[PDB]
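sry for the spam today, last one i promise. struct tokens for design, 315 residues
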């Protein structure tokens, strides 16, 4: 179950939660055609929101990518959006919801994956990669929420400390926990993790070779935007991993940004058991339609928010 009783309180709070139907996509990491037994990539979108009566309290969007090899899965979990509304005074600490929900999504293994041109059975060996960027945004998910009376907007260093604390609490025992703050000197980065014995400076991806063959291109990710540029300018053949991260630090989004940071955690060789857990699943089009409706709601206006929620409850 996603959230403990002390938070839902038998219907005082309600959840929206749904996944897309698992969909094959091209690998977000460039695979040379040379490769012997290239993986299939399956992507699942997860959307979560917490409701209080008919108002949205917070939202979380997470993309899961399964790189399916013959004997194992490389499973990337990418936090796409995390935001609060702030129309009402804060009753629960946001981290005590985001933490458990994100852990639920990381560990979820009930996907109904169709065969590549009955359902496919996944290898039991999974290698987990959790990828989070931290960037202080006023309204990542909820348009016009930034000037709601009870929206607490963290500055970049405070937001990073918050994410490190959440992520540390749901990756206990993982093989590594990496923090990079592009453009920051190493001792400034080390200060954020000095109390976290399992964390180190750097990143989780392959360290050598071409950047595009090591670093996943996630949608709406500051790292991804630079990768996109490298690819569209067809410099994918020259840009190394080390040079990519060096130049990432000078992008406008980082150099003009407020402590824009990159977190990655890995757990290697986890044996998992595939277990059905019936949740609402929707087509990509239904998912996008929901997100497009969300984009048009004035989240400073309780009427529009209530209407959006009742329309979702309706169907």
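last one done:
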């Amino acid at each position: 179950a996603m959230l403990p009783p002390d938070i839902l309180q038998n219907g005082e709070f309600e959840t929206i939660y749904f996944q897309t139907n698992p969909t094959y996509i091209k690998s977000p990491i460039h695979i040379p055609k040379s490769t012997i037994g290239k993986p299939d990539t399956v992507k699942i979108r997860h959307f979560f929101a917490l409701l209080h009566q008919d108002l949205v309290v917070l939202g979380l969007e997470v993309f899961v990518y399964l790189q399916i090899y013959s004997d194992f899965v490389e499973k990337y979990v990418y936090v796409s959006k995390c935001d609060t509304v702030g129309l009402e005074k804060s009753t629960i600490k946001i981290g005590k919801v985001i933490g458990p929900v994100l852990q639920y999504i990381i560990n979820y293994n009930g996907y109904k994956i169709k065969m590549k041109n009955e359902y496919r059975t996944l290898p039991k060996t999974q290698n987990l990669r959790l990828c989070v960027f931290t960037k202080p945004a006023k309204e990542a998910l909820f348009p016009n929420s930034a000037k709601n009376p009870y929206k607490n907007l963290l500055n970049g260093q405070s937001l990073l400390r918050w994410w490190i604390s959440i992520i540390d609490s749901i990756t206990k025992g993982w093989n590594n926990h990496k923090l990079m703050i592009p453009g920051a000197d190493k001792y400034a980065t080390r200060k954020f993790i000095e109390k976290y014995s399992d964390w180190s400076e750097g990143h989780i991806f392959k360290k050598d070779g071409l950047a595009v063959q090591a670093i996943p291109l996630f949608p709406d990710d500051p790292k991804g935007r630079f990768l996109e540029l490298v690819i569209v300018e067809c410099r994918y053949g020259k840009m190394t991993v080390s040079r990519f991260y060096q130049e990432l630090a000078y992008r406008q989004e980082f150099l003009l940004g407020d402590c824009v940071s990159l977190i990655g955690c890995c757990k290697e060789n986890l044996e998992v058991t595939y277990h059905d857990d019936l949740v609402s699943t929707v087509t990509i089009s239904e998912y996008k339609e929901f997100m497009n409706l969300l984009k048009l709601v004035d989240f400073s206006d309780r009427v529009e928010v209530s209407n959006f929620v009742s329309n979702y409850r309706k169907s």
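The radius of gyration is 20 Å. ok im logging off now
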